[PDB]
């Protein structure tokens, strides 16, 4: 009974699922002058275009945007990826604070909120034979920092207040991913982990390089939210963030010089 506290946070997790302390656990810190450029890389290629949004739910440590996976609706290939990877969902993860709540750090500067879209292998059927492998998932991580707000975002804020607990859903139909993308799609990639119980080793991180601009009100509603279930003392879903991991024999690639 895990979470982000003084009790049940990161540096409790290990206890119950060892590979907390692996050699391929996320996220890291992204040193720009140490990652290296890299030719091989194909391009990336997003095809949201019939992404087929189906709800949103408060999972007690975020809110999940899911989608149809049933077909290959809304697939990510290219970059460092070898075959095709269809999205299941997305999340973010926030701060209590504008000056915290990234996962990945850029030469140890932390953003506002990461968002994360979680892509998996189509070779592997489904999303829980996938991240039992080592090339199982992609996540493409977007950094937010505070500003002008983003449009395509609203939609997403608007609801949060019908799903402010844990275990609460609503339909969320006709959500286009597309408008939560930066302009750039640069990006650094090296091979990590889910960065919740149960840690599986088993992403191929891509984390692009040009944050998007969110606005103070729209990260303020994110704070809103609650961990606990409701008639549950509140707890106030911030700080849902693990912090860097020790890199170890990893190398970081980039797309672009
Ligand atoms: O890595 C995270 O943000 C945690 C996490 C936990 C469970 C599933 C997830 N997913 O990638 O579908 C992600
Ligand atoms: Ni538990
Ligand atoms: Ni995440």
Excluded at 101 to 117: M, N
Excluded at 131 to 149: E, H, R, T, Y
């Amino acid at each position: 009974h895990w979470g982000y506290g003084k009790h049940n946070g990161p540096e409790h997790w290990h206890k119950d699922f060892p590979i907390a302390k692996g050699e391929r656990q996320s996220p890291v810190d992204i040193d720009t002058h140490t990652a290296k450029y890299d030719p091989s890389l194909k391009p990336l290629s997003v095809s949201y275009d019939q992404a087929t949004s189906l709800r949103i739910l408060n999972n007690g440590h975020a809110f999940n945007v899911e989608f149809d996976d049933s077909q290959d609706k809304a697939v990510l290939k290219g970059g460092p990826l070898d075959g095709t990877y269809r999205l299941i969902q997305f999340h973010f993860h926030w701060g209590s604070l504008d000056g915290q709540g990234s996962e990945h750090t850029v030469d140890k500067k932390k953003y506002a909120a990461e968002l994360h879209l979680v892509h998996w292998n189509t070779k592997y059927g489904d999303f829980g034979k996938a991240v039992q492998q080592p090339d199982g998932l992609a996540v493409l991580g977007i950094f937010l920092k505070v500003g002008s707000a983003k449009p395509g975002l609203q939609k997403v804020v608007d609801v949060l207040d019908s799903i402010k607990t844990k275990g609460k859903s609503a339909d969320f139909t006709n959500f286009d991913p597309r408008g939560l993308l930066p302009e750039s799609l640069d990006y650094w990639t090296y091979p990590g982990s889910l960065t919740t119980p149960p840690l599986l080793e088993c992403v191929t991180w891509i984390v692009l390089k040009e944050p998007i601009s969110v606005s103070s009100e729209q990260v303020l509603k994110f704070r809103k939210l609650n961990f606990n279930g409701e008639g549950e003392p509140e707890e106030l879903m911030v700080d849902n963030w693990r912090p860097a991991q020790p890199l170890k024999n990893r190398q970081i690639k980039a797309s672009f010089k």
